[PDB]
Amino acid sequence: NAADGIFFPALEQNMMGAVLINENDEVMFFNPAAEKLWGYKREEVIGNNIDMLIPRDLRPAHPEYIRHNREGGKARVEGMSRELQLEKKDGSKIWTRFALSKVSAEGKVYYLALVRDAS
Amino acid sequence: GIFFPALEQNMMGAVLINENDEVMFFNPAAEKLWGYKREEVIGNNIDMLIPRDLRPAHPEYIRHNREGGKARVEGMSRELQLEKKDGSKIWTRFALSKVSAEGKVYYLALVRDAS
Ligand code: HEM
Ligand code: HEM
């Protein structure tokens, strides 16, 4: 259905990680590039909340960042690009470069974060 | 699906090309970076999006990557000078990726402003 097209294999085989979340903050997408950055397999991330991929010191503040952007609207205005400290499964930390993007589809709101290594 | 709307409404520009270096996709983020509308770019060759001083050399670099077979693209790692329609120049950052789709080879260049 989607794998037979061109847009799914673009994000799936991208050099950058790709973490899509639906309106309920559930990770519906997690390509192999994001598996190497976070150290998580696809089975451990899909279906679960977004806060598992957030560092533990940033867990208190992150649910309030997402909630505010959902109530805002702003005639749709993607987001931003900056460097953030990613926390892996094993507890180690690497610096990265995120590129967050709001994406409306079928009256709902999603978020795709394109990540790469910045060390 | 949610995959077309994701790249269409991405803050980063998105320039997909097919086997014959023809631009199949050009989202509104890439419209602002290059000064070209998507109507002007779709169907035509990649040549226009390449700077004029790099026009002759660039087609050989793409052809060499196709014959190699390698999955990961190691080129275009550091900052590069994009050339707009009007002739002015801005600095950017490219994240190039080989995409095996539809039994052919593609290339998606995700771009941003690194000014
Ligand atoms: C390495 C893991 C991540 C870290 C450390 C992180 C960090 C942050 C920080 C610090 C902010 C506050 C805005 C700012 O930076 O000034 C933020 C905002 C936000 N994040 Fe993340 N983030 C991570 C992953 C993600 C992912 C995967 C998503 C969803 C795909 C996401 C969705 C959002 C959203 C929707 C906002 C609100 C944007 C705004 O209005 O400022 N985050 N994040
Ligand atoms: C701003 C416009 C662009 C500039 C200035 C540019 C510049 C360059 C340069 C100088 C090289 C050779 C040096 C190197 O690999 O580091 C190169 C390689 C390459 N470029 Fe571009 N490029 C541009 C746009 C694109 C686009 C839109 C695509 C396709 C989506 C593309 C695909 C490739 C490929 C496949 C290679 C070969 C890399 C390798 O052999 O690993 N380029 N580019």
Resolution of the entry in angstroms = 1.8
Range of the domain at B39: 1-115
Q: What is the CATH number of the domain that holds A113?
A: 3.30.450.20
| DSSP codes, chain B | --HHHHHHT-SSEEEEE-TTSBEEEE-HHHHHHHS--HHHHTTSBGGGGS-GGGTTTHHHHHHHHHHH--SS--SS-S-EEEE-SSS-EEEEEEEEEEEEETTEEEEEEEEEE--
Helices (H), chain A: 8-12, 32-38, 42-45, 62-72
The residue in chain A having the minimum alpha-carbon distance to the alpha carbon of residue B6 is: A103
CB-CB contact of A66 with A25 (8 Å): yes
Sign of CA dihedral A77, B89, B40, B27: negative
Structure tokens at B2: 């949610």
Cβ within 8 Å of B, A 61-100: 76, 78-81, 99-100
Number of Cβ within a 10 Å radius of residue A79? 16
Number of domains in chain B: 1
